[PDB]
Amino acid sequence: YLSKYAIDMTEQARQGKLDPVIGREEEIRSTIRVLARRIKSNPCLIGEPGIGKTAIIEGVAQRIIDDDVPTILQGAKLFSLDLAALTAGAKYKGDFEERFKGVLKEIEESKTLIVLFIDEIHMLMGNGKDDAANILKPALSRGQLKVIGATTNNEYRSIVEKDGAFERRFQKIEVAEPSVRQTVAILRGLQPKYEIHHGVRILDSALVTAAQLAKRYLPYRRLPDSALDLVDISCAGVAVARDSQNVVDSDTISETAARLTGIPVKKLSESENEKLIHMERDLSSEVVGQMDAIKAVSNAVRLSRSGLANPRQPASFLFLGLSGSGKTELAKKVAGFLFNDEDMMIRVDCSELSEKYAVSKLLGTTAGYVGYDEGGFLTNQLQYKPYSVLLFDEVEKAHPDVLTVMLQMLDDGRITSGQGKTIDCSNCIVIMTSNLGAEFINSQQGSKIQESTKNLVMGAVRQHFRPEFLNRISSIVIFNKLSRKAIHKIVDIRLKEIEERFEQNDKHYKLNLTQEAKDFLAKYGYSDDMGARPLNRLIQNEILNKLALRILKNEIKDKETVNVVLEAEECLEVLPN
Amino acid sequence: YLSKYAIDMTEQARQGKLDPVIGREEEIRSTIRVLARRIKSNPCLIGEPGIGKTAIIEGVAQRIIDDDVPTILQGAKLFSLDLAALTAGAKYKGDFEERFKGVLKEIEESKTLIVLFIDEIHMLMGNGKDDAANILKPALSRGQLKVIGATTNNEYRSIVEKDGAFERRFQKIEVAEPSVRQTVAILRGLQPKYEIHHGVRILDSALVTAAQLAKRYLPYRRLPDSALDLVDISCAGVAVARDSQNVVDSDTISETAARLTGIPVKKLSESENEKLIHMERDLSSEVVGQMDAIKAVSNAVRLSRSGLANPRQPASFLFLGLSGSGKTELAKKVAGFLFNDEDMMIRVDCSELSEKYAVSKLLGTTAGYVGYDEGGFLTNQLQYKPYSVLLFDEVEKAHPDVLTVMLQMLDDGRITSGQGKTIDCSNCIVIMTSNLGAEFINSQQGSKIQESTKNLVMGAVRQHFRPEFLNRISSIVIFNKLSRKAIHKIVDIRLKEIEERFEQNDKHYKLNLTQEAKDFLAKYGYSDDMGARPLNRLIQNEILNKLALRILKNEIKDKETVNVVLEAEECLEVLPN
Amino acid sequence: LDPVIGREEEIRSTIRVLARRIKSNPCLIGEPGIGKTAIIEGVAQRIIDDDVPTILQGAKLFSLDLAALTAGAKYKGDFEERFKGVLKEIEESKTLIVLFIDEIHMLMGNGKDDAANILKPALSRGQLKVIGATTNNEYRSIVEKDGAFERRFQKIEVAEPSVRQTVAILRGLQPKYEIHHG
Ligand SMILES: Nc1ncnc2c1ncn2[C@@H]1O[C@H](COP(=O)(O)OP(=O)(O)O)[C@@H](O)[C@H]1O
Ligand SMILES: Nc1ncnc2c1ncn2[C@@H]1O[C@H](COP(=O)(O)OP(=O)(O)O)[C@@H](O)[C@H]1O
Numbered sequence A, B: 001y002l003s004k005y006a007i008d009m010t011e012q013a014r015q016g017k018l019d020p021v022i023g024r025e026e027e028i029r030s031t032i033r034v035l036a037r038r039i040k041s042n043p044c045l046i047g048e049p050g051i052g053k054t055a056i057i058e059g060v061a062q063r064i065i066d067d068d069v070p071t072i073l074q075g076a077k078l079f080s081l082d083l084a085a086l087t088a089g090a091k092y093k094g095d096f097e098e099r100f101k102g103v104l105k106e107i108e109e110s111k112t113l114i115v116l117f118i119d120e121i122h123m124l125m126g127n128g129k130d131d132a133a134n135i136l137k138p139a140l141s142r143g144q145l146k147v148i149g150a151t152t153n154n155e156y157r158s159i160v161e162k163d164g165a166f167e168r169r170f171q172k173i174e175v176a177e178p179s180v181r182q183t184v185a186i187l188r189g190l191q192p193k194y195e196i197h198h199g200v201r202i203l204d205s206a207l208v209t210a211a212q213l214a215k216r217y218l219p220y221r222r223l224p225d226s227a228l229d230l231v232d233i234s235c236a237g238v239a240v241a242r243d244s245q246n247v248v249d250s251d252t253i254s255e256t257a258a259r260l261t262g263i264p265v266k267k268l269s270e271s272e273n274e275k276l277i278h279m280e281r282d283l284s285s286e287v288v289g290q291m292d293a294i295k296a297v298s299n300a301v302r303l304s305r306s307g308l309a310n311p312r313q314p315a316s317f318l319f320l321g322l323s324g325s326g327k328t329e330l331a332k333k334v335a336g337f338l339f340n341d342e343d344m345m346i347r348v349d350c351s352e353l354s355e356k357y358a359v360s361k362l363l364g365t366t367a368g369y370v371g372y373d374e375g376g377f378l379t380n381q382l383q384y385k386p387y388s389v390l391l392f393d394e395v396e397k398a399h400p401d402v403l404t405v406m407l408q409m410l411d412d413g414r415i416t417s418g419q420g421k422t423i424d425c426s427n428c429i430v431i432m433t434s435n436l437g438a439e440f441i442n443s444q445q446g447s448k449i450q451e452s453t454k455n456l457v458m459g460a461v462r463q464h465f466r467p468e469f470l471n472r473i474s475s476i477v478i479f480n481k482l483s484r485k486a487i488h489k490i491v492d493i494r495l496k497e498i499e500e501r502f503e504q505n506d507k508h509y510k511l512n513l514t515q516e517a518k519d520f521l522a523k524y525g526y527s528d529d530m531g532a533r534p535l536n537r538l539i540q541n542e543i544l545n546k547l548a549l550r551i552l553k554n555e556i557k558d559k560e561t562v563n564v565v566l567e568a569e570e571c572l573e574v575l576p577n
Numbered sequence C: 001l002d003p004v005i006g007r008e009e010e011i012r013s014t015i016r017v018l019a020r021r022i023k024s025n026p027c028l029i030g031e032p033g034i035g036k037t038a039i040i041e042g043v044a045q046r047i048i049d050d051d052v053p054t055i056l057q058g059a060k061l062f063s064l065d066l067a068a069l070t071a072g073a074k075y076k077g078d079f080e081e082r083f084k085g086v087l088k089e090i091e092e093s094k095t096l097i098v099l100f101i102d103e104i105h106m107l108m109g110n111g112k113d114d115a116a117n118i119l120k121p122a123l124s125r126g127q128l129k130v131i132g133a134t135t136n137n138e139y140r141s142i143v144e145k146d147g148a149f150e151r152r153f154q155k156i157e158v159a160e161p162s163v164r165q166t167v168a169i170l171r172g173l174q175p176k177y178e179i180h181h182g
């Protein structure tokens, strides 16, 4: 049976057919110690996709091969007993179980200390069990039959919670994601594999770059793999050039990575330094007024960079102030400059986050219960989007259960769902917004809220939220009244970003509204409660729909001249034909 | 034939090939006495998994083969049967019954007084009767078919209380963890099993401390078995190393174990003694001022130690005073010293209460309570952290019924649950906190608050809480205003902490603030309404904001001279990079 | 739909206010049983006749009430959901929709309780136009309890027609009675 249903990895490994494993020496040492145990001799690797599971198993073979194992294990050998033997080559219920018994008996015979391994224990047990190895295997545990289990933590948890027995037969070994630098070392170990595979030379800077990029381009997959994937892709691109050479940091790899989604200048040019020294000036141009809010945000974001602030915590803010103040524009513009995607952010509508708090909760419905979008609202999105702003809209209405989770992620951001998996997105800036202190911004005590008044704003916060929450937010930020002092030019800022996307620039407007329509829109648009929100609405109707009404006359060649044709707003701005 | 899927334990015992069992002589005698009974003669050990429930049964087998068994039972043999017997061979509805009935009949039919046993009794009755090999037995109890086996107290209640008939068929026998010395004797008994299996010699003292370590280290694990985990794992450690001699006193064990939580040396040190002696002296370096509070703690701790306090319970304090005075800081720092880990603290929100509190406190329950984490907030943390500090946040806000619930910590360390399980605290020091007397501390009568102020505080305490509650407290401790003298050191603590917690050693700072920058920090970071708390935020706002940004701007490559320069707080940092 | 007359001033005010781009939501403040409905029917015809400021040229009138909060409701919070559902549908593109509420007494929620009422200040200055109506006996209490209502709505003083106005109405509706009854 073994010749059909299992692979003698140790012997293959002895011959070659192995990738030298590095950065997992402790996992191997742990595995060896477990296998050596008089009792409870079975280890299990628990990690995530891209972590190094198969390598850990091969690393064990390397120690076996060199007999760099305790006396007990010097006769040990590894066999891959999974997937193909279970379902890919199977047709009916029981095919696996009978084959399994078959190999266990071949294995049980004393053909050296056979140590088996499972690449995916989810394939065993699964759903309904039916003794899919799970009862027979431990039933025969006296006959050596040592085995190394393995799984993602997500499944480990689900499998364990359904069972709880193998959990106490198998020693847990958690396998951590390696540092980017460790990832690079892995890439270096595999450098010649890629060079041979593709026939291209790889520069050391290329390896460094790929690992760094992996952190920055494949947010849902762990670093060894994410980096190795890009390197193989990049090398293949170079091989194509070779076939019609070498692998280089930005010339091949960065662009290859960029080309997986777009990107062409981002990540490559993103040295961060000048965004702070000059990148901050951009938010204050995209968002107008509230310069200190911008600075506060910029500062804290930057503090999370380089782990200067303890890296366990992402920047985190509480945005208090007027609606229509730009508090979310800032969140988006930050995502824009910081990540190059204003819509990468995840919006959390907290006004709906009442007693339901299930699929509607970041953590999701406790796994296994009806309503199986288990973290579909936010966790799953975060797996794909850990490099963006998470924002809580009217967080003051969020159910305490949600607020609790926020606290859990607010610091020590090991974001973990009810699925049993961790996202750990310490790079996700989180913004909570609130109208809680609005009663004090409404005091009008400076368009820029002055001392005491801002303290009353913070006061309201102290009264509503638990101190622990408040003690972990990196800053409370106030979205100061925009006033004429801002909107007199915001209107231009808005009209300009519209121009730039108005007709994809095939045709464009001048729209010189002088002072007259600029003030018309600003004065009738801007609200001291709703801020610029109604202003934007006026632009859509006063200008964009109006311009459309004129273009439908089919009389334009290009540009757009202005003549503001003079109850509230009876003028309607009106630009001339 | 019953042998098809089950084991003759007595015969195994006749052949040896089974660890000898010691330290449970009374349990097995009790078991035997029960078995010898005319009526209601079945036993069932009750405890925790890993407790030795099997070993106790095995000890009985030894008694049979040694004829220490009464003559009515000398004609008996023990036979195990479970899980594989139940499910490996069960494919269709009714297979359970057929497999059991088959066995039961073979036994019933003259062939030896076999005492059948189930080590996982809750499997009988499945998840809710429907004769999941359940009714079957009472019906067959008329054939004697004597049964032993075991249950945890949790599953016991979960199943047995529902079964009812069990209670009139079995005479349950409770079991419990042995002492450490007894465990060591067990370890000595098993010592050669490892010395032979691993080849690793075990120092006598190694066995001794392994058991000690099991309690000092392996939170929720059973002393029985866990102590062996330490022995076997430690031996495996040595075995791997020697082939790449022995297990030494505490050294190899402790490093092998301690590494699982860290704190290596702290665990590998003096058995409290010196820590207890220089508790306050050393604590004063992390907790500044409040010497009396520190002394109070040191004393209670010392009393919880060495059995000086009544061993039936944990020590506790009521920490009264202003937030920011260090009530929690102290509690965390002592969690630090006590458990070598400040994160051990269990934080409890006392204000989140109503008369419907239930799962909200410990594991209390109501109809509809089910949801798995039915109050693990307090109890699972204690389960997982039995060597810890638990703290009540503004205990004055606790509902009186909850203050009563807290009685389970205040005395009588036994802790109940509506899940049918207990926690039973011991080395779980509890701190209750409150601002109940804040208006008296605000008298500011010295940096060492005068007694009449304290009397006002104690008055309020007595007025507010039931005397019964208060009486159980080891000490009620009142915190002083910290003032300049305390923050004079607190700042330095935090400054050092920040670089030490700066990932590793990435920049190093001189932190040479001199009195002036320390005063700056005090001026804008210490407040009588938040005490020293704002110092943290201020340091973030000044030191991290200004220096981190310069680092991030690549202005600060390495090192850093640190101070301030003379609206407000323009003085923040103002340093060359 | 019956013709309405004697309300041209009340209707014109309603139209001017709806046309108004800031405090654009009118409310028929006054004596109950005076044809407040008729004013709305008036508006419903002003649109179509389009004898309105061109602001309302793209507009449409609907009467959103009762079914809106109760008939389509099953449990707590449905007032917000049913209203929100509609508001989303009409927030953009599909004409300059104006809703009429028979009673503003259904606004300010069931003791506010975010019962559609939350959508009110949210939409009060978010297009989503609405015409209210009220009995003065409580109107005064609506504005004292709400505050925002007075700040967000334009009261229109409305009252019963004189006898002469009434007979004009009756004559206008004369054929409606004659036709129905024969
Ligand atoms: N030489 C090596 N050093 C470290 N890791 C390696 C090495 N060679 C292969 N690997 C990794 O083992 C991993 C495959 O296991 P893993 O992704 O963790 O499995 P799964 O998807 O099932 O969780 C890949 O990332 C693979 O590149
Ligand atoms: N420079 C700017 N450009 C465009 N909008 C700005 C700018 N500064 C502030 N704002 C305004 O902030 C408004 C959005 O405010 P916000 O409260 O976050 O949104 P919402 O009210 O839609 O929830 C936008 O309409 C935007 O015009």
Ligand SMILES: Nc1ncnc2c1ncn2[C@@H]1O[C@H](COP(=O)(O)OP(=O)(O)O)[C@@H](O)[C@H]1O
Residues within 6 Å of the ligand: B019, B020, B021, B022, B023, B024, B048, B049, B050, B051, B052, B053, B054, B055, B119, B186, B189, B190, B224, B225
């Ligand atoms: N000499 C001994 N004396 C007491 N207990 C022993 C001895 N030898 C082995 N054991 C016990 O074997 C037990 C295993 O625990 P047990 O509760 O029976 O669970 P399991 O079903 O996992 O074996 C341990 O408690 C261990 O102490």
Ligand SMILES: Nc1ncnc2c1ncn2[C@@H]1O[C@H](COP(=O)(O)OP(=O)(O)O)[C@@H](O)[C@H]1O
Residues within 6 Å of the ligand: A467, B286, B287, B288, B289, B290, B322, B323, B324, B325, B326, B327, B328, B329, B330, B482, B486, B490, B531, B532, B533, B536
């Ligand atoms: N004596 C002290 N030594 C060091 N830090 C202190 C001391 N007293 C107060 N603090 C500060 O106050 C904070 C905790 O305050 P505390 O009163 O114990 O709790 P809380 O204010 O969070 O209710 C700590 O972060 C700590 O920096």
Ligand SMILES: Nc1ncnc2c1ncn2[C@@H]1O[C@H](COP(=O)(O)OP(=O)(O)O)[C@@H](O)[C@H]1O
Residues within 6 Å of the ligand: C002, C003, C004, C005, C006, C032, C033, C034, C035, C036, C037, C038, C039, C041, C168, C169, C170, C172, C173
């Ligand atoms: N001239 C009119 N002809 C017909 N109806 C009129 C006239 N003037 C006012 N009305 C009516 O006043 C009515 C108010 O409706 P009604 O059903 O009586 O409820 P309410 O008790 O709120 O007033 C409207 O239907 C409106 O048409």
